[PDB]
Structure formats: structure tokens, C-alpha cells
């Protein structure tokens, strides 16, 4: 029951430690930060924005294939943080779950339902000892007819929740503090204000001035519920608007 106590194989498989913890899940949480990237999601009154940093170390790498933004359905987009192959497997699972939900129930899956399904699968990974949990974090973005923009994040522990703003990656603590400060000083957030808030959060937690090719922005709005990825021209316009002021 003491802090840091270990017994048997509690460090190697997902069984309880004397304190009642699961160390493998925490190790998967550290595997999330092993990727080295950071992503920020912010919810507006009529929009929702995900911004993640795009690192292409070498020119031999085709930049159009290094994407951490994925679309699950026409109206749902996601940003993945952590291990790349785990993130791609989870994206494929989410796409399958959404397609199956539409086939079986006759209407598009809500963002909360998809996050709940992914969290259930990751919980199953956390309870059975024969398989590794996924070292990836998923943030979902979409528009609900009744409630509006939705920001949902699920973790390897099986936990999921909705957010006004959230972050994931190496600098998620600093980004969450910055977003706490921004949200506490509550004021009307249009689409432009939400995009600038996310971009400036990423820039200030990374302490680097951004170029349009160094980040990746995806948005959903009430007017256009389809998930889309901003091109370099639109990101450049947003960056210029940020830099002038």
C-alpha cells in the first residue's frame, strides 16, 4: 500500500500493485510522450479546431504523407499523439466503428459515442494481460446537431471526456495551463479567435515562431460541418493575422 511498492509481475503485466495501480498503463502514457510532438484542441461557440506540430526532419521525406490529422467520417476528424503505428491502428478502428454504426443504426455516429467505443476497446486492452495497450492519444472533433461543436479525448487508460479545450503530447501540461488561463478570462470566441487561440497556445508552449509548414490545422464549423484540413495558404493567413498583432 506504500507509494512505489511492487509485488510479483505488476510492473510487467496489467495487474494491480499493492497500492492499487496499473504500471503498464502509466508506461503507455509515457509512450505517448515518447513521440515528441504536441497537439492542441480548442472548442468555439460554432467551431472546433485541432492544431498539431508537423516535424519533417529530412527533405527526403514526402511531407504530404506525414500527417497526424485524420478524418473518421465526413464530419468527424481526429488528431493522434504518440506512437505512429498505434495511432494508425486506432484511426482504422475508429473509422470501422463509425462506418458500422452508420450501417447498423441509420444515422451518423456522435463524437461522444465514438470516443466511448474507443475508450471501451482501450479498457479491454488494459484489463487483459496478454496484449500491450496502445501508446497513443486520440482527440476527436465534430459537430452535434443538438449541442454543437464537440471536443473529445480518449487515453490508453480507457478514460474519455469532453473538453472546452485540451492538449496532448510532451507539452500538454503547459498547454493545459495556458488554455485554463485563456478560458477563465471568458470572452466570445469566433472561428478566427479559436484558431488563433490554438495556434498561439502551441507557439507559446513551444516558444518558437511558427511557419505554415510546421503546423497542421483541421476545423469543423456549424456552417460547414464537414471536417477539413487547412492548406498552407490559409495557415499562412492565420499566422500573418497573429503576427501583425
Amino acid at each position: 500500500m506504500s507509494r512505489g511498492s511492487s509485488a510479483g509481475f505488476d510492473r510487467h503485466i496489467t495487474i494491480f500493485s499493492p497500492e492499487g495501480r496499473l504500471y503498464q498503463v502509466e508506461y503507455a502514457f509515457k509512450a505517448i510522450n515518447q513521440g515528441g510532438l504536441t497537439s492542441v484542441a480548442v472548442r468555439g461557440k460554432d467551431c472546433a479546431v485541432i492544431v498539431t506540430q508537423k516535424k519533417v526532419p529530412d527533405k527526403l521525406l514526402d511531407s504530404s504523407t506525414v500527417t497526424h490529422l485524420f478524418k473518421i467520417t465526413e464530419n468527424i476528424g481526429c488528431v493522434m499523439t504518440g506512437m505512429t503505428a498505434d495511432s494508425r491502428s486506432q484511426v482504422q478502428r475508429a473509422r470501422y466503428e463509425a462506418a458500422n454504426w452508420k450501417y447498423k443504426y441509420g444515422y451518423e455516429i456522435p463524437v461522444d459515442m465514438l470516443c466511448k467505443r474507443i475508450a471501451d476497446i482501450s479498457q479491454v486492452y488494459t484489463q487483459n494481460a496478454e496484449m500491450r495497450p496502445l501508446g497513443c492519444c486520440m482527440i476527436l472533433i465534430g459537430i452535434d446537431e443538438e449541442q454543437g461543436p464537440q471536443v473529445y479525448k480518449c487515453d490508453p487508460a480507457g478514460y474519455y471526456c469532453g473538453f472546452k479545450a485540451t492538449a496532448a503530447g510532451v507539452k500538454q501540461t503547459e498547454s493545459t495551463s495556458f488554455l485554463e488561463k485563456k478560458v477563465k478570462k471568458k470572452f466570445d470566441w469566433t472561428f478566427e479567435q479559436t484558431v488563433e487561440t490554438a495556434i498561439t497556445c502551441l507557439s507559446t508552449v513551444l516558444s518558437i515562431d511558427f511557419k505554415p509548414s510546421e503546423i497542421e490545422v483541421g476545423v469543423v464549423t456549424v456552417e460547414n460541418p464537414k471536417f477539413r484540413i487547412l492548406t498552407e495558404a490559409e495557415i499562412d493567413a492565420h499566422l500573418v493575422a497573429l503576427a501583425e498583432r
Binding site: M1, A7, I13, T14, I15, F16, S17, P18, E19, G20, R21, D112, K116, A119, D120, S122, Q123, T126, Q127, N128, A129, E130, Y152, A157, G158, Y159, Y160, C161, G162, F163, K164, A165, T166, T176, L179, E180, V183, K184
Partner: protein
């Protein structure tokens, strides 16, 4: 890729005759958020604390108090995803009972089935026991019920009980304050006071979740009603 699991039990007896995995699951439960259940004369109140680590969370998106049927409600202490799994299984079991008998499941039968599932996970191969204790309330045959199911698969019928952090102090407080013939509103007041006994910080209508069960059925209390009760306290 291989879809086979481990076929040997991960919970085994110790030289002293104890299943230490169950005790560690109980420790995980005891490290969870406080939960209180009080059986009144005309109903049951389930109360718990839900304080997010940040204001960025959406308080209205995830519910710790969940309905199983129109007359049965749930609340937990411990690990949230395990609670979600058990809620799904409890709802499925209740729906199967209704499909078979065409009458709503009694609270005791649902408690027995959920405890059977928890025992299955405590004995089967390649899995760990659930890290949650459940507080199950219900109204059957014009009578209220309150049950607690632990990670080992054992269940108890309670007049009033507490789970999670400072649950011994909460139990002593309930012993001091609980009495029979209690009305539902007084039970809600006592549950909120029990939560306040260990609550750290300021308790608002969003920091706590309250669910009530009576003859009309089980329902979650809206934040406005919780605010009214807090102002009345």
C-alpha cells in the same frame, strides 16, 4: 498477431489464504472518489463527488451516476472505465431479464448477476479483477433497496454506506446521523453533508452528482436541483 489469451488464473491463493489481487483492487477502490448511498423510508439517494482536475473539462459529458433501468441506478468508486464496462453489462443483464420475464428486474437479482460477473473476472484466466465498488439503488414492490458490490464479487444490503476516500469517517458520520423513517429530502441532505465531511475545496452544483430512486423511478438530479439542495444546506 494471436487472438488467444492467457488460460491461467492471475488471482491465486497466498500461504495465508488470501487473494491479494482482490485486496489490491480494494485498495484501488479505496483510493477512489467518495461515494455515499442512503436508503430513506420512501427512496434511496446516491451521491458522489466529480471534481475535474481542470476547468477545461466538460462537466455535462461524463456521468458518474448512471441509470440501469427505469427503477435502478448506479454509482461507483475506483476506476471509471471499469465502471463503464460494468454499467454496460448490468444494462444488458437487466434487458435480458426483461426479455425473459417481461417484468423489470428486481434490484437484488441485478446485484446478484453483476456480482457473478465480477467473480467471473476474479477467477477466470488472463484477467485482473475490477477496480471498482458499486452502489446500487432500486425500487421494487413498493420498497427501496441499497446494495454495495465489491471487486471480489460479494454484495451487501445497506441502510447507509460510503465508499472511496475517507469512507470509514463517512461510515461513522452516517452511523451518527442515519435513522429509520427518514424522508428522501433529509436523506439527500445527509448524503451531501457526508460528502462535505471529506470534500476538499468548495462544493458546488457541478462538483457533485446526485441520483435518487423512488416510486416514480430512478433519475439523476439536475444541477439546478443540486444547487437548491446546497443552498438549503
Amino acid at each position: 498477431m494471436a487472438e488467444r489469451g492467457y488460460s491461467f488464473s492471475l488471482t491465486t491463493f497466498s500461504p495465508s489464504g488470501k487473494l491479494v489481487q482482490i485486496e489490491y483492487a480494494l485498495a484501488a477502490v479505496a483510493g477512489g472518489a467518495p461515494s455515499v448511498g442512503i436508503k430513506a423510508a420512501n427512496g434511496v439517494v446516491l451521491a458522489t463527488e466529480k471534481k475535474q482536475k481542470s476547468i477545461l473539462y466538460d462537466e455535462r459529458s461524463v456521468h458518474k451516476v448512471e441509470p440501469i433501468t427505469k427503477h435502478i441506478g448506479l454509482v461507483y468508486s475506483g476506476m471509471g472505465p471499469d465502471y463503464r464496462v460494468l454499467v454496460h453489462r448490468a444494462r444488458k443483464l437487466a434487458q435480458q431479464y426483461y426479455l425473459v420475464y417481461q417484468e423489470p428486474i428486481p434490484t437484488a437479482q441485478l446485484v446478484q448477476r453483476v456480482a457473478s460477473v465480477m467473480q467471473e473476472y476474479t477467477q477466470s484466466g488472463g484477467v485482473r479483477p475490477f477496480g471498482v465498488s458499486l452502489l446500487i439503488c432500486g425500487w421494487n414492490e413498493g420498497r427501496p433497496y441499497l446494495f454495495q458490490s465489491d471487486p471480489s464479487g460479494a454484495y451487501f444490503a445497506w441502510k447507509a454506506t460510503a465508499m472511496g476516500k475517507n469512507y470509514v469517517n463517512g461510515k461513522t458520520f452516517l452511523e451518527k446521523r442515519y435513522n429509520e423513517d427518514l424522508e428522501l429530502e433529509d436523506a439527500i441532505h445527509t448524503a451531501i453533508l457526508t460528502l462535505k465531511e471529506s470534500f476538499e475545496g468548495q462544493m458546488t452544483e457541478d462538483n457533485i452528482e446526485v441520483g435518487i430512486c423512488n416510486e416514480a423511478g430512478f433519475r439523476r438530479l439536475t444541477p439546478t436541483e443540486v444547487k437548491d439542495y446546497l443552498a438549503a444546506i
